[PDB]
RNA sequence: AUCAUGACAGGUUAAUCUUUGAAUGCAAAUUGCGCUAAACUCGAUCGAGAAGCAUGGGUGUGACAGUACUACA
RNA sequence: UAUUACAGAUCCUAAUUGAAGUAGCGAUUAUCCAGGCUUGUAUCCUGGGGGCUGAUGAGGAGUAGGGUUUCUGGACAACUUAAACAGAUCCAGAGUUAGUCGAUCCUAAUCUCAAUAAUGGGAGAAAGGGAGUACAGUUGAUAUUCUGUAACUGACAACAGUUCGCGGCAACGCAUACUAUUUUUCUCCGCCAAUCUUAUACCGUUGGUAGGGAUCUCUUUCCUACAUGACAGUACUAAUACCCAGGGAAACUGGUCAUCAGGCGAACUGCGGCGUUCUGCUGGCAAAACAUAGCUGUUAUGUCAAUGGCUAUUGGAUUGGUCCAUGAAGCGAAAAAUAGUUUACUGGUCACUCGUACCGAUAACCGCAUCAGGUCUUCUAGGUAAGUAGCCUAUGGCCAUUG
RNA sequence: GAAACUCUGAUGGAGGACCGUACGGGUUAUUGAUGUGCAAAUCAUUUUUCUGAUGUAGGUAAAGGUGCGAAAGACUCAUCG
């Protein structure tokens, strides 16, 4: 960046909208506990390698 | 010499995302190391029988193929 | 005062196309303005000299100018300058005149056998 | 052992000719049946080759980068053909030319391009006319039957006496082999270890083995003096 | 020249599919778009990612019956297209926005 | 943005059916500038206060005139 | 939504079937660069979309090339 | 009937001791005092001292790479070698606007298919080639992209008015088509050295007026400000290159910093020709912008006059030297010649696609990490001095660092 | 000075010339500091080079009994007889 391609930009979009906390209502629905979002990361710690 | 200082100028990318594999496509050599694109046949060897069955059928959706298993259950039961 | 100024275009390096000059604005702010390229303009074949009566601008913006200012009026107007055209007239006359006089010569010489 | 620097020139990755600024292949026009006049448009210098080239025009204008005899000038009229007279410039078949005279860029086969006697300050000499085969002496000493129909430029090639002046500095030879090809600088075989070269190894630097080898000797093995019917100081003869 | 003996694909589709209604998804609700409506007379919309400015200008005209002056086209970090559509001087952008709501 | 010397040539440029407005504007040395807008260019006309009164009348009636 | 004009996390079959991939209009680290008789569909004669257009080989159909063979001029 | 009894295998996996509240809390300029917000600050903010960085700066900006780190609001379980209301941390929302900047288009080194009835096609550069944009304003984050104002380039349409080739001895000037073939030019090219000169910066002699700083004494003082974009025009001043007309050169003359030039035509004269630079005068243009003064958004005045650089950088001009080194191609554009077909020229609409935030090492890249390492480039102030050294200081940025 | 030429001063700016800058290229010495490092090769002072056989960036070529090597068995992703 800048000067990213479009299909590069498509991946970086999907990588940041997927990065969030898990919703509250799944724990209320299924009753499971201790499920983490796997595709959470931090930009500084883990690099994507894409 | 060969350690921390020489890690500095490591900014170029040897491999790039591959269309068929989507995973390690060699930019200079232009071949997907994992799948062999663009060779029409897809890369696997019998020495990597472990790593092959991660890629091969069953791993994905099987949209067309799962309904053709399900027919053959009904006909013989 | 601080009179230092950034490059505006996203190319960093100091190539021939990316060259700047500092300029005062209306607003008392120094700023990069980019230098358009130099043009040599039409030299001649033979010798290798500058022809007169035409600007060295780009040949693309030479099209936008009038058909007057694209050329010089003579035969071989753009390509050849003056004295080289004089020499071509003198040689291409006397090459053809010697060849024409050769046809007069071989007409006149062979008639001596009859008389 | 490893593969030796003599063997590694074949595979041809870094050992290719630096052929970028070279202006073109120096040869005659093709044969095509008398006499044809040709103006020297200009004489130019191409990199690598020590001789000049002279670009001719056989005016359409058909071009030909012919290699340059000495005493050619710009806007001379060169005359390729049989019935062209003798000047330094002109391109005659070997039927027509007198014996005991110096010629340049002589062809082996007719209509070829030009083969023997091309480098700067060289010339094939003509011995005598047999019948079909005009016998000529090449610059080395060797003598060659060549057919009388095939062509040769008249006179000696330009740029003579370039090795008369030595190159004092390693830098002058760096710029010499930049135009040509990578083959320099040369590390000597004794200096290298035994795996790298045949002559290498040992506590004290020395060759050890006879250092003079057959035509039958293999790749890897042909190093040093190949099939040397004499050695040492060539005193007389 | 070529002429096939039968149609290959006989079934034509039922509607346009790539429609005026499915180019323009709907308006964007932010604090920036609120200012650009009031000040510059300039709307904002989420758009299809393959839609051009020529497609948007015609599609905006067919729905709301106002021919736009300019269209300027972002693709966001969310990877959906945003279209800043300037309306002309006569119509007010608040009056078009109140109809939609 | 070109300048035009002659007051006669200005009135030829005014009556083209290109021009959208003329702008009257006071200047230094008690002059004034009549800035004719055209689609391409902006034709200015510097004048002295002798012939200032006549030129405004000369201008076509249809063309709008914005005073500053 | 209830003795049915029939609820939905049920099970089939048929539609619809985004960008890709043998991937196939030509390419590709690019949302790059093309082509088309009618019909289709909006668009007001003429634009657009929709849908076409790969290589190899088989049988048929047509066209071109030849001082290849031959007859009649 | 058996995957059947453990203290050891530098055994395997999982948890946990002593050492030990010990080693240690580094590197980076320097902190101090009063307020604000709070249960709570040396640390977060304000004000005032004292300092540091000291134009290759922890300044302002970009390639490659990172990928939301950018912005506003709320939050402190953890992390940022103590503390914390702070943060590049956590949470919720928001943000990247182009016919003119790039990509796209062309080829280079190089790679890959096809044909041989062929003489190629395609790929390959976000530093090469490459048509065309500038100023001012605005947001919490975007701007050569938005708004205002002024340009410019290309393609596709009809339509109105002109026009059917002339000037100069000459150099050349002025209003003229299209297809094709061939030929030539621009694009277009190494490195080094010298001289001259615009622009920008800086230092200067001469004054001046606006505001602010300083004052026991002295200083008609000190500081800030004194500015005009792309683009378009036509004056004569005066340059050097080259060419033309006259002129017709040894008692050789003219000329450079330097080499030099000339009967293949020098000096020299023309209110010669022409190209590139230059000075002045305008348009753009004061309506904007900035600084004072006053009124509640806007009204006043003002941004002036003269003329040097022995200083530097940049663009350009005029030249020289050097090489067994001679320093890209292609697309594209124009011209000319030779055929043939001819009337031409000047003056509404539209401009697709994709990138655009921020960092660029100083904590945002690579080194497992907020690592004294490493990694390409840009704008470059004053004084001292030979200085892009070292040392000191305005603009800008800072107290990075447990007490 | 009879000549062939050679004395003095300026002009000029050649050289793989010299001194010397850097967030340039190298890495000599203190066998300094560090050695539970800031660092799986660093830091300080000193030293070498600084228009060139120069440094450097991107693209591109060469692949494991091979490659490449101004040659140390060097280097070929902290790995190399």
Please characterize this protein's 3D structure.
The PDB classes it as ribosome. The entry lists the keywords Trichomonas vaginalis ribosome, rRNA, rprotein, ribosome. This is part of a larger assembly, with chains A (50 residues), B (77 residues), C (115 residues), D (237 residues), E (101 residues) and F (68 residues). Chain A is an all-alpha fold and 50 residues long. Chain A has two helices and no strands. Chain A starts with 5 loop residues before the first helix and ends in a 20-residue tail after the last helix. Chain B is built from two helices and two strands. Chain B has helices at residues 49-55, 63-75; strands at 15-16, 25-26. Chain B is elongated, with a radius of gyration of 20 Å. With 115 residues, chain C is of the alpha+beta class. In chain C, 30% of the residues lie in helices and 9% in strands. Chain C is built from two helices and two strands; from the N terminus they run ββαα. Chain C has helices spanning 59-64, 83-110; strands spanning 20-24, 30-34. In chain C, strand 1 and strand 2 form a beta hairpin. Chain C is rod-shaped and about 105 Å long. Chain D has 237 residues and is mainly beta. Chain D has two helices and twelve strands. Chain D is elongated and about 70 Å long. Chains in contact: A-E. Chain A binds chain E through residues 6, 9-10, 12-14, 16-17, and chain E through 75, 77-79. Chain C binds three RNA strands through strand 1, strand 2 and helix 1.
List the helices and strands and how they pair.
The structure is cut from a larger assembly and holds chains A (50 residues), B (77 residues), C (115 residues), D (237 residues), E (101 residues) and F (68 residues).
Chain B: E1 15-16, E2 25-26, H1 49-55, H2 63-75
Antiparallel strand pairs in B: 1-2
Chain C: E1 20-24, E2 30-34, H1 59-64, H2 83-110
Antiparallel strand pairs in C: 1-2
Chain F: H1 7-14, E1 21-26, E2 32-37, E3 42-43, E4 46-47, H2 52-58, E5 64-67
Parallel strand pairs in F: 1-5
Antiparallel strand pairs in F: 1-2, 2-3, 2-4
The structure holds three RNA strands.
InterPro entries (chain D): NA-bd_OB-fold, Rib_uL2_dom2, Ribosomal_uL2, Ribosomal_uL2_arc_euk, Ribosomal_uL2_C, Ribosomal_uL2_dom3, Ribosomal_uL2_RNA-bd_dom, Translation_prot_SH3-like_sf
Family (chain D): Belongs to the universal ribosomal protein uL2 family.
Region (Disordered) (chain D): 199-218
